[PDB]
Each structure stands twice: as structure tokens, then as C-alpha cells.
Amino acid sequence: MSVLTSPRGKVEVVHCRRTESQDVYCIKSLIRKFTCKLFGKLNIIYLLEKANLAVTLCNDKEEIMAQATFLDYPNWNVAKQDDWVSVFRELDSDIPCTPLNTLFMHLFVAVDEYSVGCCKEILRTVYKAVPELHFIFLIVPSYMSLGSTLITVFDQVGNIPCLTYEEDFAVHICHRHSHYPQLHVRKARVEDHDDLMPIFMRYDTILKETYGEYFLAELIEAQDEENHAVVCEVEGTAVGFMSVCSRVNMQLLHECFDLGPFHGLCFPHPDDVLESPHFRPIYRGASAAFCIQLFCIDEKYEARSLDFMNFVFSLFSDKNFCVISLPHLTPEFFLIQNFVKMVPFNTCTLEQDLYVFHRAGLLKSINIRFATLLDTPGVENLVSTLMLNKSILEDLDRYNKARKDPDGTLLQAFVAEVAEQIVGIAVIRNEMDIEYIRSHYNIEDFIYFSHHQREEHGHMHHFALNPIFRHYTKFFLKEILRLGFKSCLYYRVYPKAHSLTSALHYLVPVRPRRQIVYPLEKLGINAPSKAVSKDPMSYALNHTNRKLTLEPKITVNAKIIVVGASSVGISFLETLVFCSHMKFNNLTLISTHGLPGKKLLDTEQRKFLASDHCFNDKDYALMSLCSWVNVVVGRMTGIDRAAKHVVLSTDEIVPYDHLILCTGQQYQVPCPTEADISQHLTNREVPNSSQRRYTGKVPCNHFTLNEEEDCFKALIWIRNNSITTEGNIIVYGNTIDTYTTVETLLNLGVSGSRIHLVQPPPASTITCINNYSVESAVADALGAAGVTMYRDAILAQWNDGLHPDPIYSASFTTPTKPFRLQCSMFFSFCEKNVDYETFKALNDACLVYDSRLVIDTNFHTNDIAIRAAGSLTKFSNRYYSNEWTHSNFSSKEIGFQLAAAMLHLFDPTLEPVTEPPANLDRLIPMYKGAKIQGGILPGSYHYLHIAKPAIPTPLEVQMAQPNYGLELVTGSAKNGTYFRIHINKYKMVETITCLSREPFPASNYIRLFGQHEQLLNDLYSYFTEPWCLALFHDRFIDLRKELRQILASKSIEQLAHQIEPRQYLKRVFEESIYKTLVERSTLDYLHYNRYH
Amino acid sequence: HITKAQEKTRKRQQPIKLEPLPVLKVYQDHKQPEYIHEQNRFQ
Amino acid sequence: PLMKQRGFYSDILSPGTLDQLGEVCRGPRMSQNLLRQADLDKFTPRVGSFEVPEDFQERMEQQCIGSTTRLLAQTDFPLQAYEPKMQVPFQVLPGQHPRKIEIERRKQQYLSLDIEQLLFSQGIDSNKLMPRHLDHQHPQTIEQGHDPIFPIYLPLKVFDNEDFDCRTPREWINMGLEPGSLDRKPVPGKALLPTDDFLGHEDPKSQKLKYKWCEVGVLDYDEEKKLYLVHKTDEKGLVRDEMGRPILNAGVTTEGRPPLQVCQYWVPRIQLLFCAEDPCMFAQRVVQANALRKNTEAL
Amino acid sequence: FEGKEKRLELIQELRTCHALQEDEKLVKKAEKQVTLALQRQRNLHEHKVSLVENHLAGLEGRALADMFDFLSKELVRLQEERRIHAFVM
Secondary structure (H helix, E strand, C coil): CEEEECCCCCEEEEEEECCCCCHHHHHHHHCCHHHHHHHCCCCHHHHHHHCCEEEEEEECCCCEEEEEEEECCCCCCCCCCCCHHHHHHHHCCCCCCCCCCEEEEEEEEECCCCHHHHHHHHHHHHHHHCCCCCEEEEEEECCCCCCCCHHHCCEEEEEEECCCCCCEEEEEEEEHHHCCCCCEEEECCHHHHHHHHHHHHCCCCHHHHHHCCCHHHHHHHCCCCCEEEEEEEECCEEEEEEEEECCCCHHHHHHHEECHHHHHHECCCCCCECCCCCCCCECCCCECEEEEEEEEECHHHHHHHHHHHHHHHHHCCCCCEEEEEEECCCCCCHHHHHCEECEECCCCCCCEEEEEEEHHHHCCCCEEEECCCCCHHHHHHHHCCCCCHHHHHHHHHHHHHCCECCCCCEEEEEEEEECCEEEEEEEEEECCCHHHHHHHECHHHCCCHHHCCHHHEEEEEEEEECCCCHHHHHHHHHHHHHHCCCCEEEEEECCCCCCCCCHHHCCEEECECCCCCCCHHHHCCCCCCCCCCCCCCCCEEEEEECCCCCCCCEEECCCEEEECCCHHHHHHHHHHHCCCCEEECCEEEEECCCCCCCCCCCCCCHHHCCECCCCCHHHHHHHCHHHCCEEEECCEEEEECCCCEEEECCCCEEECCEEEECCCCEECCECCCCCCCCCCCCCCCCCCCCCCECCCCCCCCEECCCCHHHHHHHHHHHHHHCCCCCCCEEEEECCHHHHHHHHHHHHHCCCCCCEEEEECCCCCCCCCCCCHHHHHHHHHHHHHHCCEEEECCEEEEECCCCCCCCCCCEEEECCCCCEEECCCEEEEECCEECCHHHHHHHHHCCCCECCCEEECCCCECCCCCEEECCCCEEECHHHCCCCCEHHHCCHHHHHHHHHHHHHHHHCCCCCCCCCCCHHHHHCCCCCCCCEEEEEEECCCEEEEEEECCCCCCCHHHHHHCCCCCEEEEECCCCCCEEEEEEECCCCCEEEEEEEECCCCCHHHHHHHCCCHHHHHCCHHHHCCCCHHHHHHCCCHHHHHHHHHHHHHCCCHHHHHHCCCCHHHHHHHHHHCCHHHHHHHHHHHHHHHHCCC | CCCHHHHHHHHHHCCCCCCCCHHHHHHHHHCCHHHHHHHHHHC | CCCCCCCCCCCCCCCCCCCCCCCCCCCCCEECCHHHHHCCCCCCCCHHHCCCCCCCHHHHHHCCCCCCCCCCCCCCCCCHHHCCCCCCCCCCCCCCCCHHHHHHHHHHHHHCCCHHHHHHHHCCCHHHHCCCCCCCCCCCCCCCCCCCCCCCCCCHHHHCCCCCCCCCHHHHHHHHECCCCCCECCEEEEEEEECCHHHHHHCCCCCCCCEEEEEEEECCEECCCCEEEECECCCCCCCCCCCCCCCCHHHCECCECCCCCCCCEEECCCCEEECCCCHHHHHHHHHHHHHHHHHHHHC | CHHHHHCHHHHHHHHHHCCCCCCCCCCHHHHHHHHHHHHHHHHHHHHHHHHHHHHHHHHHHHHHHHHHHHHHHHHHHHHHHHHHHHHHC
């Protein structure tokens, strides 16, 4: 927030901001012929794409009047990117110029009325942005002058000849002391009290109301051997206070946190137990650490918080380590960005995280170079306990012998050395699957792929760094790019091959792209390439580039705990993680055994449960939250809101800062009625048994399939007990899961005579298989299979009065045919309800429950730190929308909008959160994500259903409504060629129903929602033509909105606006000049889609 | 109105927390005038 | 909801006490994501095979940036020469400010107050106070006299008082002396010195002179007529002769006192302030001296 | 006291429509008619305004996907005829 003044006296309020995409036009406007002479002919888009740092300065109107561009290699062709250091030392050895503290300037544009002030504020901004930087360097032709703007900030060293031309070049340096010098650090005197009081009062007055007004004076006055008070001052006036104490608790430290990497910050001792004869190591050595108690600094000088450190380590000569403990909610500041985050033990109850630094990290003599044969003992010493150390050594040996992967790919290795000791090792190769990476991942969100050559992409094999020097990981990545010519580095994470890295904190995840299931046999030579249509093993993609090696991340250390691994929770954590500039540290999902996708189930086995088509196993392997979300295995049994923790079934407790409940609904064990049938009473007069819960021991032959682990248990147990040969099966339910289990048993080998299906409709107007055609098809195929049908059968008893573990027989009461039948197998899918353990957990915690968890629109519970989402939720009665719950909407969209709400809490770039107004207090937000219901029905019928989110109404009533519209039905459901499209009154898709014997691309068919004129133009053969393939492309919606804004700008939306003569509208469309612009956007889409 | 059960919950509820620095309370309680008086007993 | 930026801070890993929190064993059986695996014990490089450099001087020879605050416009004014007098013990009661704060606070509220604004707050101009010659060409007796129609006649020193000086000049010089050293250094202060030092020295009561308060260096004090030696200092405050040392012990030689150079003058306490004395006691003494001198010219 | 304190807020979530109706003869009837009228005219006004805006957006997307189907036919047919004259030469 600076103030600039022109030489004419005009005053502007300026600020530095990040570079935008529209900025290039303003920069090209600001480009002068003198700028072209000073920096050659530059592609601005290419330069900003490759740039380490582009800095823009604007005003209150956000008019662009300044910009500068910075990279890590010389401006002109006077020194090589790898070897500029030696040439610059030969130029002037007195300059301590290293890649760690030297940066190069390539383009500077400014308005001439404020050019000098713009330059000096940009230099101050970049010196605040990178605190280690000390020298900013400019190369110009030696026969030209700098000009009045740069001559006030740049000082000449001499001349360097060009490497490709016979021209000397004048060289100029700008020093950090001239604009943002190092703060002097000294011992605190009691006279700094008045200097430091307003700095403390700009943050907190709890110190004043707790320890009085002279507390800082007493603290400085009582400096002794163990405690030191330190200040940093500018012009003799203190701008930062500091307090260090030599006494630390290694007992509590080893009890709570994991400090294996640093011996618990104690000296090595012979009596130390480091291995098990988790195992907690025992250290007997003396403590080599001290702690920071107080630290404050002015915001003007917060970038130089690192200057205290040499002085405080000079004071504490006998210690090697310095610690802070800060609770989970303090945002990461500049001093703590250098420190290393410690891991608490799994039993830790402390409210504060710990950060640790070691004295050797202040050594600025770190050298990165190409790996040689002599560094192999150092690599061995650093990796000898690391996992796949043999693989890392094998890659190092391959590089040292032939520099090649045995398939012929170029391999490179880089080493980081501190005080003649190797501290880092990295192995990369050239990347050959760049086309597959682009076609299957969102790499266009990070780089402009057209500006990057093939050799500039490096696949990242092995990363290992010293945890002491972890703060130079970002510098390590930048130097790896500089030395090995790479502009992009890609890291692949494979589901459990496995690998080793520590840069993945500073690396950003890449969102996988949805792929079109191409009909390759009919596309033929119009089909996309093998890299586009490939189906290799699924992996997570991770990315870095040169701009990212100077871009920082906003870190959230808050304990965000999400209960329940449903589709809503998966989508919520996925959208949390795939925010690029976020860095979450304490995202933890509590689940029964983990997030879905634990077991690699086959396609013939996955038909136990129907698919909502939000997530699947290949998606899970692509998205890989086992690389970003901590996972708790176990059932929760209690919530303490005031102490902010959750009690599990293992009597173990997870503290939370934010709680999210997404367990969904699960199938419950039906309690038998135990009503006598000897009097042959009517089923009307006997009391209903819907509410009662089975409180006895669950039988070993009773199964409720709610997740993949339950399905795997059922498959295992069936295979061990050989039930396809002799046992008889009763499945009690009326959901789609019931039919899919019966079809799965038929696939597994259960004969149709032994299986018995029962569906009782007790009440309610819910629409189960509402279309009459597929309902009749289900009934006809069921009768043709000859499975024993029983309808309206309420479970009277198991075992007829004896203990039902295991069930040998059961009884069912029916208005038509009540039957006592030998029940050996009992699958239950009758109803879904909240699990009893969770429900008593929330009830004892006093969360609101009116038949479901009552939430508001912003998903708040009655506690503002606890939120709920999924099928377990019901909105408040203040909305008067009790018929509307989250079960009516798509789960993935619900989780996505949960995350959209939650990033506003922790993202400074996004708007801060606000309370709901009366509008949002009085309605609920609507959602347009279509509800998908897919599976495989009996008769090997792949069945898909895509519906608009709505209250369940019978399809006969819906078509009897006058606004139903049109209906297109092709094929026969009994023949397995059924296709159904419902066209509404506005000619959009509202319902799709698919029942086919052959598998079809459901992931493609999802996009068919809302296709107007395409509908107006066998339906499988109708969607065979590539008009729907173009509709099925993924980048289509992205360009939809930009040409929407183009056509809204002058217009067509106005022509519609006095439409509320259809041929009149079409004729004025043909008259208006949007056709040429939309054909230009057609050519742009073609540019985007000659690849993919 | 408040209850004795409510004050029991208030005694159970609050988190446990300690000093700014232990040596900080040690020298403050060590330079208290009362500690000057036990120092007088020490002389 | 929520809270931000408590002030950094830390809890205490207090070595003596373990009992305040209780048993830390109530957390889950945790299955981390593999970055929180990647910062574990053995799946990081372990410290047991580490090496260290040997020299501390290597950092101070590696550094290339000096201290801005320690490299400023350096001077030779003693820091004890800025210390005011104080009737406060070393050990105040807890809750009260200590003496180092008290000395500092009177220092900033001395240097925050200017004496010329004090002058025209009282309604007094020092050039008109310092006596002038008679201009018999232009008759002083007229109908417009602000109070004395005849100008200031006997000097301010002849009419002043001295005992309101909180130190006598002997311990003023002793305060100027450095502890444990025979060397003495000039004491900063301001004196009513003529801007034209030349015409000041050959004609101290000329009508063309103008007398402003400017900073000087107090050097010595003579007892038989009771005056202070002053000399103008420059922006670095360093006080030289032709061979360049700072003037210490007045340049008093065993052969005799130094011959007088052009700039150092003898001035009284009516004319001089110390930097360690209150401009408010200075105000009250000068207004009482002006009132008494008005009374005596009235008589 | 503790019974009210533990589940005080669910009472107000049910008190969305208050259930007593003795002193709130005077006020809560007006509140019921106002809140049903609020639901009514919110539904009316906002649903037809949002429906009209959705009609505009859908018609514009309809024109988009019409020329987009033209684009797809153009692209695939270009690839076909390019390979056609390729093997013709």
C-alpha cells in the first residue's frame, strides 16, 4: 500500500498484485521502442509463462502502470544458464553472487510520469517476496545507456562479451541494502519498551490485562544466562521483539511428537534405544535445543524475521536447535515458513503444533551440481535407512554409468552439498508421456503447453532431502529446472509403485480429466492417437514449474476432521485438496475402514451395490487422497463439543477444529415382529414393526452390504462355505441393491431355485422402477428366471422362538401367502437409516435430530464448528422444505459446494465468510447436478438412470402433468435394447433410462443432460454420430461461458429480451454479426482440439 | 438461575493452561516483596 | 466464528513438570497419508550419521551486508551526558516503573520540547533580550514602547540566579567525566550564541547581532568568574584542532592552558542549557529571572 | 434446568411454528399467515424470474450446440475427406 509522486507533484496510491491473463495487452501497450532496444524482441506470453517472477504494480482503479520480469539466468546471451556463476565470478569475484541470492531482470515497463517510483517499489516488492535475494542483475548492450529510470537503481560493474555476437554488453547490479536492507539485531534494552508497545497492541491486549503494563520491561530487565531478550531496530528504534529460553521438556516432547529424524533434539548417547529389540525411541543425551516464547515484528519488516537468528544462535552457542509451538490456527508467517513442521504422535493431545530448526540451516554455502561418482558414499550415508534406497542407488548407478534409463531415456541426477557434505539427491528423466499427461490431466491449468518443448518436461524419479535443509526444497526445485533445462516436472504416485519424496508439500496435485469412451472400432482412422485413447495403470499426477518455485502457498494447519467416507465426503476432501495454492496439513477422514476403494474389486463382484456414478476405483487411483488426507480406521462413538473431540469405538479420541459428518445412511438389521400366526390374524391389526431395532446378536448368516469391505466379507464367506452348491438364500429388500445382489449371485453361480426374494412395501408413495415398461420387464425376467417371489412379507421370526445365530429357518407373514421357510442365508436391504452408534453419539452430544440431522443452508449444525452433509441431513423447518433433503441431490455436487463454502473460511484470496441473510434463512439453495443410479439388474441388464433432482413423484403422474413434454423410447426392455429420453416442455433432458444387455459408456451418457436442439434434431445409433461426441468433450463448458459473455456483450441476449416470430428471431440471428465471432471461437476450439 | 450442578460443570469445563515462562513466574515471585521478606529470613 | 493471530507465542515444554496435562495416550490408531509418512523417523534421513562444520568465523566472513543502525552519522557525545537527575531508588515496588524507564522517558520528553517555541509561548525574543548599543541617531524614546522604551541595559548574567541549577558545575563536570577514566568528553547543550560569531567576539552588544539558541559543546567551567566553555559542533559532532583529535580534557597541557581559538567562548548559566536538564525548569528559571530583572530596572 | 439447557435449540427449531396458542392467539396467527405468504410469493416471484433467465441461458446454449454439432460434423468430415484425397494422390 505505497504512495508514489510524479515530478509534477501528482500523487497516486499504488499496490503490487499478481499477474493476470488480461495484463499482457496492457504490457504490450506500455512496451516502447526503447524497451525493445533494451530487451530485444520478446514474446511476452512466453516470457511470463517461463518467468520465475512477474510482478505488476497498479493503482486504486487497478490500472496497470508497472511490471517487471525476473528469471534465474542472464538477460542476454553472455553466460549459460548452467554456468553463469563462473563467468560472473570472472567478471567480479568480489560479488558473492550465487543462484541462491542473485536474480535477473528481463522486462520492465512503466509509465514515464512515475517510472522511478514504480521501479523502486517493484524492487522493494521482490526483495520482500524473496528474502534470500541480495542481487538483481541487468545486462544491456554496451553501446546504449540505461536511461533516467534504471540509472537511479542500477550500478555498473563492467562489460561481458556476447557468446554468439561480436558485441560487448554493459552489466549492472542493484543491491538489497539500497532498498530493503538487513535489520540490525542486538540484545534488548529496557529502553525499547515504548518502541515495542504499539507493535504489541496492534495484535493483542490480553498481555496488558493479564500481566500488566510493565510486563515487557520486567521481561527485558531480567535477562540472564538461560533467558535472552533480543530486538531488531531500524534507525535506533525497535521494530521487533524476541525472547528465547534454554529450558525444554524432552519427556513431553518425546511423549507427544515424533522426533526420530533429530534424535529428539538431544546429543547422541551410547545408551540411546533407537530400534525395537509404534516403537517410541528412547534418548538419553543432553538437550541441544532452546525455545522461542515471544516474537513480534512490524509488518513492514516481516520479511526479514530471519535476521534475529544468527544473533540468537550466537547467544546459545551450546544449543543446535530452536523450536516454536504454535496452535493449529495461526497462519504461517515468514519466519515459520523456514522452519520444519514436526509430526505429533498418534496419541498426542496437545493443542499446539511444533516447528523445529537446526543451526546448520543458516549456512548459505549450499551447492547444487550434477551428480558424480564421488558423491556415492554421501548418497549411501543419507539414504541408507530410506525406503527403496536400493532403487535410488540403482538409478544413481545407472546415471553414473550410462546416464540413461535402460529403455534409452535421458536420465539426470542432481546433488545438494552443505560444507562438503551431500544433503540432497534428486533423480529425473526426460518425460515421454507428455501427450497422455495433457490428455488425461489438468496441466493446462498450470502451464501453456504450446510454449513448452518436449525436452523441457522431466519425470521426477527420486527426491531425498535433509530435513534440516528442507526450507531450501523450493530453491532445489528451481535449480533442478535451471541445471537440467526443464520447465515442467511431473511426479507420478501409484496406488499400493510406491516411492519416496519430500517435495510433495511444495508440489501441486493435478486434477485428472474425464475421458470420452471413444468407439474406436468405428472411428478407425478418425480415432484419436494411442496416447489419447490409452488405458494404462491409473496414477496421480503432481507438477511443478519455474513460476511455482517462487509462488508460495497459504497453509492451513487446522484440524479439519470429516466423519464418514461417503461420496459427499470424498468430493469435499477432493475439492479441498485440489486447490492449488492451498497447503492443508491436518485433513483427516474418519471411516469404518477407510475411504472407498480399499479393495480392488472385480467388475463381476462390484455388482453387489448399485453405483451413483460419482466415484469409482480408477477415479480413486487418479485422485489419491491417500497422498493428501490422513485416514482414521474405526467407528466413532461419541462427540464432545466443548472439549472439541470425537470418541471412537476403540476408546481412542481425535480432537477437531472443524467437524464434518458424512456417514450417509446404512442398511439396518430388521428386527423381527415375533407375532404369532396360529390365530391367522390380519396384518392390519398387528402393530407395525418398522421402528424396532434388532438388539440381539447379529447372526453370522445375516449380511447388510453397505460398503466394499462388507461386500468382500460376503464374497469371502460364501466362497469358504460353498453356498452355490447347497444353501438357500433369502434377500429381504426392495432397493436396486437387492436386484443387483440377486444378479451377482446368479453370476457367481447360485441357482435360481435356491434364491428367494422378498420385497414388502409397508407404506409411502416412493417410486421404485416407476417406468411401466421396465417394471414389466423386471417382473417378466424375474418370472422367467423362476426365482421364488414373495410380496408384502413382514419378517415374523428367525428360528421360530430360538436364538437366531445362525439362522436355520425363518417365518414371514403375508396377507396372501404367509410362509415358514428354511432360511440359511439372510441379506438385508429393506431400509436405510442412521447408524445407532452415531445417532446416540450425536444425541448425547446434543446435536439436533428431527428424523435426520437438522442443518441450515450453510450446513451449520447447532454448533458452529460442526457441520453435516449427505443423506443423513434434513434442512431446518424455517425453510418449510421438509420434503427436500440432500438425498434428492447429487452427492458429489453437495460435497463440492461444502468445500466451496469452506474455502471462504481459510482463503484470503476468496471473500471472507458472511452470515445468511433473510433470503437464505427463508429458502434453501437449489442444485442442478443430476441424480445418477446405475447397476446391473437380473438378466445381465446394465441399467442406468439419470434424473433431475426432484421430490419422488410417480412417472404416470409426471406424464399426466401437461408440462411433461415429449418422450422418446427405442428398443425393448425385455430384449435388452431399451433407451429412454424424457424431453421437458422447454425441450431439455429431465430423465434418461437405459436398460441394455451390452455395456455402454455411462460416463459418456451422463453429459446428455439438457441438450435442446440436439434433442429436436435406435437412439444408441442416434448418439453414435459425433455431434454428441463434441457435446461429450470436457473443455466444452469452459469455452461455453466465455462465448456467453461475448454474445451478451454488444445484442443477442437483448434480441431475446424483447422476444419476451421465432423465424424473425432466427433471421435477426442470421443478420447479426455474431456468426463471424462464433466461427473465430470455432477455430479457437479447433486449436484446443487438434490435440484431444 | 445458576445451579450447583452447573458450577460443577464449570469446574470440569475449562482447559488447563500454565504460565508465560516458568522462569518468568520464578523471577517475578522471586522479586516479589514477599520473597524479599523470606530473603530477610534467609539473611 | 474462529480467531486469528493471537500474537505468535508458544506454550512451555517445561522440563520440571509433567503432571498438569495428564497421560497423553488417548489418540487414535492413525493411518497417515504418505507425506505424513514421509516425515517419519526412518523414512527420512536420520541424524545419527550427520556431520558438522568447525568454524564460527566463516559466517562473519561469508556475510556481505553491514549494519545500517550501527553505521550511521556517528558522534562522540557520551550516553551518560544525556542522563537527568532522579530521586528514585534502584528497586521500585512491583507494578511501578523502574529507573531506567524513568530516565528514558524524561529524555524523550526533554528532546520533544523546543526552547524557541517556549520563548514565543512566553512572549519573549532572545535577540531583543540581549542588550544592544545606543542608536542616538534614531531616538529610542517614542510613543510606541512594548514595555521598556529604553532597551536592555544591564546584562542578563548580572541579573540572573544560580542555585536553581540542580547540579553545581563541579559535579556537572564530574557527570561529564567517564567512569573509570581520566578522560572527559564534551557535554551536549544549547547556548544563546550570536549567529555571527565574529561580530559576537569583537562586539557582543552590537545592534546588528542576532542571538539564537544553537547547539554547543560544554567543555570546562571556571570558578573565579563562574563560566562554561562552549564551541560549535558540526553534523558529526566531532571537535578538532589543526591536528585532529577530539578536544578532551580541554586540551589542558602541563605547560599551561591552550591558547584561545576563534570559536570557543565563555558563556553563563543564564545563556546555557544542558541536555540532561528539564526545559520546564529552564522555563521557570528564565521567567523568574526576567521578572526580577524587570523589577530591578523598575527600581 | 439442565433438561432445558441440553436441548433448548431443538425447541426453537420446532417453534418455527409455535405449538401452544394461548397468548400467541394475538401474534402467532399473523406470523403463520405471513410465513405461508412469504413462502408463496417467494416461490412465485423467484421461480418465474429464475425460470425466465434459465430459458434465456438454455436458448443461447441451444444455438451454441446447434453450430457445435455443425462443428463436429465439419471436423470429422474434414478428416475423412483429407484422408480420401491423401490415398487418391
